[PDB]
Structures are given as C-alpha cells and as structure tokens.
Design an enzyme around this catalytic site. Structure first.
Site, PDB file in Angstrom:
ATOM      1  N   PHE A 122      21.445 -25.266  42.744  1.00 37.07           N
ATOM      2  CA  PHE A 122      20.229 -25.788  43.037  1.00 37.07           C
ATOM      3  C   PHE A 122      19.806 -26.860  44.037  1.00 37.07           C
ATOM      4  CE2 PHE A 122      19.282 -23.419  39.409  1.00 37.07           C
ATOM      5  CZ  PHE A 122      18.977 -24.033  38.002  1.00 37.07           C
ATOM      6  N   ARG A 330      20.022 -40.463  45.674  1.00 38.60           N
ATOM      7  CA  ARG A 330      19.732 -41.548  44.698  1.00 38.60           C
ATOM      8  C   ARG A 330      21.122 -41.761  44.059  1.00 38.60           C
ATOM      9  NH1 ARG A 330      15.384 -40.983  40.153  1.00 38.60           N
ATOM     10  NH2 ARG A 330      16.552 -39.270  39.417  1.00 38.60           N
ATOM     11  N   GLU A 425       9.842 -48.757  38.940  1.00 46.95           N
ATOM     12  CA  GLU A 425       9.884 -48.042  37.623  1.00 46.95           C
ATOM     13  C   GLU A 425      10.588 -49.007  36.543  1.00 46.95           C
ATOM     14  OE1 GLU A 425      12.581 -44.907  37.617  1.00 46.95           O
ATOM     15  OE2 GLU A 425      13.976 -45.899  38.699  1.00 46.95           O
ATOM     16  N   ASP A 453      10.570 -43.996  33.702  1.00 54.50           N
ATOM     17  CA  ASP A 453      11.574 -45.144  33.392  1.00 54.50           C
ATOM     18  C   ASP A 453      10.474 -46.296  33.167  1.00 54.50           C
ATOM     19  OD1 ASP A 453      14.579 -44.549  34.891  1.00 54.50           O
ATOM     20  OD2 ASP A 453      14.163 -44.931  32.893  1.00 54.50           O
ATOM     21  N   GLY A 609      22.693 -32.728  32.494  1.00 52.26           N
ATOM     22  CA  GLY A 609      21.993 -33.870  32.396  1.00 52.26           C
ATOM     23  C   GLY A 609      20.458 -33.619  32.881  1.00 52.26           C
ATOM     24  N   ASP A 624      15.025 -35.501  31.278  1.00 53.33           N
ATOM     25  CA  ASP A 624      16.060 -36.200  31.611  1.00 53.33           C
ATOM     26  C   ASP A 624      16.358 -37.511  30.846  1.00 53.33           C
ATOM     27  OD1 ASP A 624      15.122 -37.219  34.994  1.00 53.33           O
ATOM     28  OD2 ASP A 624      14.292 -37.735  33.059  1.00 53.33           O
TER      29      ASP A 624
HETATM   30  C1  LIG Z   1      16.378 -27.663  33.842  1.00 54.21           C
HETATM   31  C2  LIG Z   1      16.601 -26.520  34.780  1.00 54.21           C
HETATM   32  C3  LIG Z   1      17.920 -26.207  34.790  1.00 54.21           C
HETATM   33  C4  LIG Z   1      15.667 -25.402  34.377  1.00 54.21           C
HETATM   34  O1  LIG Z   1      16.010 -24.211  34.929  1.00 54.21           O
HETATM   35  P1  LIG Z   1      15.066 -22.838  34.891  1.00 54.21           P
HETATM   36  O2  LIG Z   1      13.651 -23.097  35.762  1.00 54.21           O
HETATM   37  O3  LIG Z   1      14.831 -22.625  33.510  1.00 54.21           O
HETATM   38  O4  LIG Z   1      15.884 -21.701  35.314  1.00 54.21           O
HETATM   39  P2  LIG Z   1      16.127 -21.374  36.923  1.00 54.21           P
HETATM   40  O5  LIG Z   1      16.521 -22.603  37.682  1.00 54.21           O
HETATM   41  O6  LIG Z   1      17.440 -20.148  37.285  1.00 54.21           O
HETATM   42  O7  LIG Z   1      14.679 -20.822  37.602  1.00 54.21           O
HETATM   43  C5  LIG Z   1      14.392 -19.945  38.658  1.00 54.21           C
HETATM   44  C6  LIG Z   1      14.915 -20.827  40.067  1.00 54.21           C
HETATM   45  O8  LIG Z   1      14.582 -22.194  39.761  1.00 54.21           O
HETATM   46  C7  LIG Z   1      15.257 -22.878  40.912  1.00 54.21           C
HETATM   47  N1  LIG Z   1      15.210 -24.415  40.343  1.00 54.21           N
HETATM   48  C8  LIG Z   1      14.730 -24.723  39.373  1.00 54.21           C
HETATM   49  N2  LIG Z   1      14.584 -26.441  39.485  1.00 54.21           N
HETATM   50  C9  LIG Z   1      15.057 -26.744  40.652  1.00 54.21           C
HETATM   51  C10 LIG Z   1      15.342 -27.707  41.290  1.00 54.21           C
HETATM   52  N3  LIG Z   1      14.836 -28.886  41.066  1.00 54.21           N
HETATM   53  N4  LIG Z   1      15.806 -27.805  42.778  1.00 54.21           N
HETATM   54  C11 LIG Z   1      16.417 -26.744  43.325  1.00 54.21           C
HETATM   55  N5  LIG Z   1      16.128 -25.457  42.515  1.00 54.21           N
HETATM   56  C12 LIG Z   1      15.371 -25.442  41.354  1.00 54.21           C
HETATM   57  C13 LIG Z   1      16.715 -22.306  40.888  1.00 54.21           C
HETATM   58  O9  LIG Z   1      17.443 -22.679  42.041  1.00 54.21           O
HETATM   59  C14 LIG Z   1      16.444 -20.790  40.424  1.00 54.21           C
HETATM   60  O10 LIG Z   1      16.710 -19.957  41.529  1.00 54.21           O
HETATM   61  P3  LIG Z   1      18.025 -19.186  41.983  1.00 54.21           P
HETATM   62  O11 LIG Z   1      18.214 -17.939  41.408  1.00 54.21           O
HETATM   63  O12 LIG Z   1      17.945 -19.004  43.358  1.00 54.21           O
HETATM   64  O13 LIG Z   1      19.052 -20.079  41.435  1.00 54.21           O
HETATM   65  C15 LIG Z   1      16.238 -27.171  36.029  1.00 54.21           C
HETATM   66  O14 LIG Z   1      14.907 -26.744  36.704  1.00 54.21           O
HETATM   67  C16 LIG Z   1      16.360 -28.596  36.364  1.00 54.21           C
HETATM   68  O15 LIG Z   1      17.783 -28.946  36.701  1.00 54.21           O
HETATM   69  N6  LIG Z   1      15.354 -29.203  36.662  1.00 54.21           N
HETATM   70  C17 LIG Z   1      14.986 -29.444  37.967  1.00 54.21           C
HETATM   71  C18 LIG Z   1      15.377 -30.716  38.738  1.00 54.21           C
HETATM   72  C19 LIG Z   1      14.591 -32.131  38.582  1.00 54.21           C
HETATM   73  O16 LIG Z   1      13.324 -31.941  39.112  1.00 54.21           O
HETATM   74  N7  LIG Z   1      15.300 -33.128  38.298  1.00 54.21           N
HETATM   75  C20 LIG Z   1      14.700 -34.285  38.458  1.00 54.21           C
HETATM   76  C21 LIG Z   1      14.645 -35.418  37.468  1.00 54.21           C
HETATM   77  S1  LIG Z   1      14.060 -37.063  37.712  1.00 54.21           S
HETATM   78 MG   LIG Z   2      13.803 -43.422  36.656  1.00 51.44          MG
END
Ligand SMILES: CC(C)(COP(=O)(O)OP(=O)(O)OC[C@H]1O[C@@H](n2cnc3c(N)ncnc32)[C@H](O)[C@@H]1OP(=O)(O)O)[C@@H](O)C(=O)NCCC(=O)NCCS
Ligand SMILES: [Mg+2]
EC number: 2.3.3.9
Length: 718
Positions: A122, A330, A425, A453, A609, A624
């Site tokens: 990711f 972060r 936050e 948060d 996480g 999260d």
């Molecule tokens: C929860 C999570 C695993 C869900 O996954 P999903 O969308 O159901 O399944 P996928 O990720 O395989 O969806 C397809 C594509 O989305 C991408 N993706 C989803 N969220 C991403 C992220 N924020 N950053 C980079 N790529 C992301 C993947 O890279 C994937 O493509 P790939 O085949 O090249 O790896 C994932 O989206 C995630 O960790 N959350 C986003 C991170 C985020 O914004 N968190 C911040 C919290 S403050």
């Molecule tokens: Mg926060």
C-alpha cells in the site's frame, strides 16, 4: 544489547547499524550515545506532560460530578478551565517563519493520502498515487452509475466506458477550456508554434488560456500525451488510437491522468499495529526503503517506486515533473512506551522519542541521491516532515520542538530540518490552537482537524457531564462546526497561505465515491488547502475538487474573519432531554459493537491496524484507532450514566460477534470468536475497551490493544 544505560533489542540494533546508519555520516558509537542522553534528558518532561493530562481530566471529572440536573453554567466552566491552566490564554498575533519547505506543501492545494507504513504494498501505491488514472477511478467506482444497462464485469463495457469518457471530457471543458468548442468534439491534438492546437470537425482551436499548456510527449506533429495545468495541478491526456479505449474515442484519447495525492503521510500511528521491537523495525525498514528509493514488493510483477516524468515543454525543451508523492511520516504521540529498548530496571522507553530518532535518522537518506543513500530524493529543499499526533496544548507542542532539536543535534542536521505537521485533534489543542502554532512557529508545515480523535477527546473530556448524542449526530453539534472553522481562522491568521497547509479530515466511506465527489468539495470551499483521503482512487477523485474550487482565492476571501467563539468550542454535545426510544439505543449499541469487534478482531489476531468494517446499515467503513476511540468512548459514556447496563453491552457484543465472523469467514488466517467468547483475547479486548473505557487516559485505546496483542502473540509461539 547493552549501550550506555540501555537494553536495545538486537532486532532494532542490527537494523539501525547495518541498514539505517551507513551513509548518514553519523558515527554509530556517537549516534547511540546521543540516543541515551536525549532519552535521559527528555523522559521527565514526557512523563510530566502525561501526568499533567491525568490531573486535568480528574479536576474536570470532579467538576461535572459535583453538578447535576442544574444545566451547565458556562461562565463558571470557562473560569474553572482557566484556573486549572487547561484553557491557557490567547497570545498576540504573529506570522510563522517556517522555511525550507517544498512547493507541494507551501503552494499546491490537493489531496493528501495517508497509508500504513507496515504495508509495503500500500505504501508503494501511496507514493505512486501522486499520479492516477481518472478513467480507472470513474470506471472502478460508483461515480459513473452501474444502472441504465452500464454494469461493470470481467469484460470491458462500451456503455459504461463512454459514460467515463464523457465525464472526463466535461472535466477538461470545466477546467482547461478550449477557446471555442468542447473537448468532447476533439479529433486529435498537435503542437504548433509552441501552443496546443486541438482539432475539431468545424475548426482548429487553442486554449482560452495558452498558459494552461504545460508540455507534451512524442512528436509535436502527433503527440502520445498532452500535459496541462490548472490551479497548479497537472492534467495529462494520454493518446493512443490503437488501445482498448482509444479506438472508441473521437480523438484516440486513451486515458486522462490527474496529479492526485500531492503529499502522502506514511503512518506509524493509528493505521498500524506495532507493539514490539519486531513490528517497529518492520515499519522502520519500509520507511528507509521509501527514502532510499529501492523499496520493492512482489505481486510475475515487482512493484517499485515511480521515476520522475519527462516532458517536452511548449517551446521545445525537455523537463521533469516529480513522479512521487512528497512524503511525511506520522510518528506516534507522547503517550506510549515500547518493549524495543528498556531501562536497566525494566522500564520501557517512550515510543514517541524513539520514532523521532529512528524516523529522523532514516529520513536522512531521502534528501540525497547517492550510492549509499539510494537514488530517489523526497524533499528537494532539504526537509524532514513529521506529523505529530494527539498532542494536548501548547507545552506539548513545544516539547515536540525541543525533542526535534535534540534529535537534530544527534543527527548532525541543521536546526529546523525536522518540520512538524500539527494535528488539531484534541480539545486542549483546539481551544489553544494559536498558542500551539506559536510553539512550533518555525517548524510547523500544517495544521489538520482530525475530527475523529477530536470526537474521541470530546466524549472523554466531558465523560461526567451526562449522556452524549449518538455518534451519527456528532457531525452537526456546535463544538465540531466551530472547530473546523476555528482551525482555518488560526492557520490563516498565522500566515499559512503560501507557507503551510490547512488540512481537513478523512473520508471514511471507501465505497461511497459518488458521495465523496459530491460532498467533500465542501472542504476546499472552506479554505482547506489539503484534506485526507483513504486511497489513490479516492485521491484521483478528490483531485477534481481542487480543479473546481480556487483554494488560494477562498483563503484570501476568508482572511481576518472570526467564525468561532470560545463558548462554541466548549459547547458539550450532550443529549439534553432527548429520549431515544428502545429501538434506537439497541441500534447504537449494536452499531458500535460491530464496528469494535470488526476492528479489534483483526487487530489482536492478525496484527492489522486498519480495516474495512461494514456497519449495522452495511456501509463499509474505514476504521482505525480514532474510530475505535469514538465507538468505545461513546459506549462508556452511555454506561457511566446508565443509558445501558454492563449486561446490555455483553448481550450486544455476544450477538454482534458471530456476525463479524460471517463477514470474515473467507479469510485463510481468520480464527472466529463465537462460540467460546471467553477464550478469545480478541473478544475480551473489545470488551475491555468498553467496560473499562471510562478509565483509559483521554480515551486512548493503545494501552489495551498493545497489551492484548502482546498477549495474543505470546499465545501463538507457546
Ligand atoms: C482497510 C484496507 C486494507 C481495505 O482494503 P480494500 O480496499 O478492501 O482492498 P484493496 O486495498 O486491495 O483495494 C484495491 C486497491 O486499493 C489500494 N489501497 C487501498 N487503500 C490504500 C491506501 N490508503 N494507500 C495506498 N493504497 C491503498 C491498494 O493498493 C489496492 O491495489 P493493489 O492491487 O495495487 O494493491 C485499506 O484500504 C487500508 O489499510 N485503509 C486505507 C489506509 C488509510 O487511509 N488509513 C489512514 C487512517 S488515519
Ligand atoms: Mg488522530
């Protein structure tokens, strides 16, 4: 491994000495001598600030408890908060002086992406999300509706495809307009006399604004792509008249590429589950490899970081745009300590101090392009960007600054190389925002309303006031509407325009992309020069909003206004004579219990996480710790005032748990909680965050998650 006063785990020690330190011109024996001293010199403060929080919570806890049925006298509340030094004064007007910052933070307005750093897959996609396909973002999501016989499938559909093509044509028409005619009529593009020429059935046409032509690729006579620029963000029109999508297009347009995720936050905080030396190093490794540039992940494909993109300029010269999202990291906040390195007595070292050190040192590699350092530079101006979360008030910000300054000495960096992105936050920060900005006046690179948060601190800070509103209602309370506005006012009055980002919150509904395009525009319209998105697809789509809103202008229009009083900020989001019917209370508890078990189960078991967890209306939500903070906190509130009983939570937890197994059933690694709930660390962890949530410091969920995951891990080798 004994060093000065420390027991550094070998997994870290090896990593920092072999992988991280070579090429940094820092003597390994001196580096670790600095570490020892910094940690020693600064641990008292870290605990002193942390103690200061607990005290304030108790005093405010006392105050509400010795006051019931006679609604809050808001002038005594405000006087109380001043007496205890919670509500510190408001300082005199100033202007931040932060220098050495990249154009993409100071000037460009566009989406900001946040990704878990423990996930190389990711992360790579995240840094590469600087540039994203508009066709894929529209075809892949619900922006283009699947109805009217235009469903997606395993075979490409013309009907859906032409809807996608049309949408993007409207976009180009809306953003970089032809002098006369519409893009949807184009038959081809050329470059004559260093100007873009667009062929139509009836005429040939330049742009309304020739200054929006940025360059091209291939022969001018018939380019392979045409590069444009609007509101400082690039748009690329890919041409291939022999492509799956090309042959269907009047101009042979293959795809429209939007410069999307300008900056990316590589996350060690709420996105990730790192509870020991191993986990810690594993994410330190990924950060190092992003900074070197060599980070790769296998999929017959290897996923690497994109190289910079070359173009011909209008007049004919060759030039280069950055291929990669400019990275922040972060670190974690001031709370937690970690196994990684311990005292002689067995006391763990503060995780936040260690992040600053190891994250700082690693980031060195991302400022140069050597053999040892690796080929790709991150900050071309020589800065290291660190998002510092969950800070409570001006003093805690000053501490981060002081911590940073010592981490600079130890690294041999010039002072103020380490810039800080400030989360807004926590309540104590929100009400003292100007003061926080002043404490980092020479370092600050952004402020951001981390509404999530922030919602968490609102519930916990005001735990004893009474029952809170349901979490769906939070978005329309006085305190949150003032906090958004208040953030923008303070940033702008600190001269953030042209100097630093004013940032807004994350979009949590990863499947409602049709909603996000419609709704999130409100953020740039509110003057936010950046805002947070959950994926590269989301980033491509949010990009659209910055082509429409002229953020720089909106900032100029908003300068000097004062749209929030301190009474509005301290307005507590109480139920206040609203009686929910039996069904509603059972909905909120059920809702919250699913969201909890959904997130915690993948946290404690799988070490993940951040998760997609569907709710009690079955909207997929990005959960999260911050979301867990609200969920658990709210349920604790309802418990503290007997809207629910302890028993009510159990029964809901018990009936919600088997469902989260059903949605998780397709997983190879998943082990389900039902039917034997009491022999499940996961279940018991979710149950702790509610039944003992009123007792967690500022409602933080790390103590339990870290301890319960530590637990699970031991009961996995045994
Ligand atoms: C929860 C999570 C695993 C869900 O996954 P999903 O969308 O159901 O399944 P996928 O990720 O395989 O969806 C397809 C594509 O989305 C991408 N993706 C989803 N969220 C991403 C992220 N924020 N950053 C980079 N790529 C992301 C993947 O890279 C994937 O493509 P790939 O085949 O090249 O790896 C994932 O989206 C995630 O960790 N959350 C986003 C991170 C985020 O914004 N968190 C911040 C919290 S403050
Ligand atoms: Mg926060």
């Amino acid at each position: 491994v004994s060093v000065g006063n420390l027991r550094i785990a070998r997994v870290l020690y090896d990593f920092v000495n072999n992988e991280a330190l070579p090429g940094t011109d820092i003597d390994p024996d001196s580096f670790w001598a600095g570490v020892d001293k910094v940690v020693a010199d600064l641990t008292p403060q870290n605990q002193a600030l942390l103690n200061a929080r607990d005290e304030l919570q108790a005093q405010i806890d006392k105050w509400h408890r010795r006051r019931v049925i006679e609604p809050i006298d808001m002038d005594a509340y405000r006087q109380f908060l001043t007496e205890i030094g919670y509500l510190l004064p408001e300082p005199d007007d100033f202007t931040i002086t932060t220098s050495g910052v990249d154009a993409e933070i100071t000037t460009t307005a566009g989406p900001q992406l946040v990704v878990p750093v423990l996930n190389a897959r990711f992360a790579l996609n995240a840094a590469n999300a600087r540039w994203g396909s508009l066709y894929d973002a529209l075809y892949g999501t619900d922006v283009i509706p699947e109805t009217d016989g235009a469903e997606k499938g395993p075979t490409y559909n013309k009907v859906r495809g032409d809807k996608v093509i049309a949408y993007a044509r409207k976009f180009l028409d809306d953003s970089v307009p032809l002098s006369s005619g519409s893009f949807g009529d184009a038959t081809g593009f050329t470059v004559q006399d260093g100007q873009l020429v667009v062929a139509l059935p009836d005429k040939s046409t330049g742009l309304a604004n020739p200054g929006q032509f940025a360059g091209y690729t291939g022969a001018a006579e018939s380019p392979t792509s045409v590069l444009l620029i609007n509101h400082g963000l690039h748009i690329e029109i890919l041409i291939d008249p022999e492509s799956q999508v090309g042959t269907t297009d009047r101009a042979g347009v293959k795809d429209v590429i939007l410069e999307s995720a300008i900056t990316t936050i590589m996350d060690f905080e709420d996105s990730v589950a790192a509870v020991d030396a191993a986990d810690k190093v594993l994410g330190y490794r990924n950060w190092l490899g992003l900074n070197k540039g060599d980070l790769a992940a296998a999929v017959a494909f290897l996923r690497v970081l994109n190289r910079d993109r070359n173009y011909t300029a209008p007049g004919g010269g060759q030039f280069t745009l950055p291929g990669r999202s400019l990275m922040f990291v972060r670190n974690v906040g001031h709370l937690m300590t970690n196994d990684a390195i311990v005292d002689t007595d067995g006391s763990e070292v503060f995780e936040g101090i260690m992040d600053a050190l190891f994250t700082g040192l690693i980031a060195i590699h991302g400022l140069k392009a050597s053999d040892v350092n690796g080929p790709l530079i991150n900050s071309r101006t020589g800065s290291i960007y660190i998002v510092k979360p969950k800070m409570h008030g001006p003093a805690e910000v000053a501490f981060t600054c002081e911590l940073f300054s010592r981490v600079e000495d130890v690294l041999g960096l010039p002072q103020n190389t380490m810039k800080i992105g400030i989360m807004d936050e926590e309540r104590r920060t929100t009400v003292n925002l100007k003061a926080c900005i002043k404490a980092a006046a020479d370092r600050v690179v952004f402020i951001n309303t981390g509404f999530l948060d922030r919602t968490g601190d609102e519930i916990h800070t005001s735990m004893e006031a009474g029952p809170m509103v349901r979490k769906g209602t939070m978005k329309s309370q006085p305190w949150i509407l003032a906090y958004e506005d208040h953030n923008v006012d303070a940033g702008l009055a600190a001269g953030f325009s042209g100097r630093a980002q004013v940032g807004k919150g994350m979009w949590t509904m990863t499947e409602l992309m049709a909603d996000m395009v419609e709704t999130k525009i409100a953020q740039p319209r509110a003057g936010a020069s950046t805002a947070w998105v959950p994926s590269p697809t989301a980033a491509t789509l949010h990009a659209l909003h910055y082509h429409q809103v002229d953020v720089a202008a909106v900032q100029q229009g908003l300068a000097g206004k004062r749209r929030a009083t301190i009474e509005q900020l301290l307005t507590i989001p109480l139920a206040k004579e609203l009686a929910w019917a039996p069904d509603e209370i059972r909905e909120e508890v059920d809702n919250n219990c699913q969201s909890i078990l959904g997130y915690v189960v993948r946290w404690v078991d799988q070490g993940v996480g951040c998760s997609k967890v569907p709710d009690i209306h079955d909207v997929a939500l990005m959960e999260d710790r911050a979301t867990l903070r609200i969920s658990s906190q709210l349920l604790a509130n309802w418990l503290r005032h007997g809207v629910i009983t302890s028993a009510d939570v159990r029964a809901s937890l018990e009936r919600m748990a088997p469902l989260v197994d059903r949605q998780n059933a397709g997983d190879v690694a998943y082990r389900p909680m039902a039917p034997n709930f009491d022999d499940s660390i996961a279940f018991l962890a979710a149950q702790e965050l509610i039944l003992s949530g009123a007792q967690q410091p500022n409602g933080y969920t790390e103590p339990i998650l870290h301890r319960r995951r530590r637990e699970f891990k031991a009961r996995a080798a045994e």
